[PDB]
Nucleic acid binder design. Structure first.
Ligand SMILES: [Zn+2]
Length: 86
RNA sequence: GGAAACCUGAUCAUGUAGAUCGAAUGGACUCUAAAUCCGUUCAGCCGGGUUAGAUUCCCGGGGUUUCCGC
């Protein structure tokens, strides 16, 4: 499993995973320089580094999650898309 | 010029989903206050190796500190 920058990982899945292991659905994301600006379906906005070595990058290279965000309304199809990356 | 240690909100830790703090935000409560609490969110400086799996081990870059040297 090659270690790519975070924007590649969310570009492939369309999903975000928070520090609590919660999956959110990405509504918008945009890169600027080394930052990513992200807007979830549930309304949360966040600004992170576009690192290939971050904690959330490690989570997105793996296939586990603790819970899905209710307000994001993640479909079983998208969740399954995340679980079967390989 | 050379050696060692460490790494970007803070302190610490770390091969099988790191932690605590702090901050942003929503709510509860409240008197549409303060205080308090709860939910949500925020991480590995960069570029590679190795690995089933790495912020974590190895190499390199950059930076900081300490130490050695014309
Ligand atoms: Zn959400």
């Amino acid at each position: 499993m090659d270690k790519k920058p975070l924007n590649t990982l969310i570009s492939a899945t369309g999903l975000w995973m928070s520090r609590t292991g919660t999956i959110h659905k990405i509504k918008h994301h945009e890169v600027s320089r080394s930052k990513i600006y992200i807007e979830m379906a549930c309304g949360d906005h966040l600004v992170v580094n576009n690192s290939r070595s971050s904690r959330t990058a490690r989570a997105l290279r793996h296939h586990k999650y603790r819970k899905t965000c209710k307000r994001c309304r993640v479909s079983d199809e998208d969740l399954n898309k995340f679980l079967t990356k390989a």
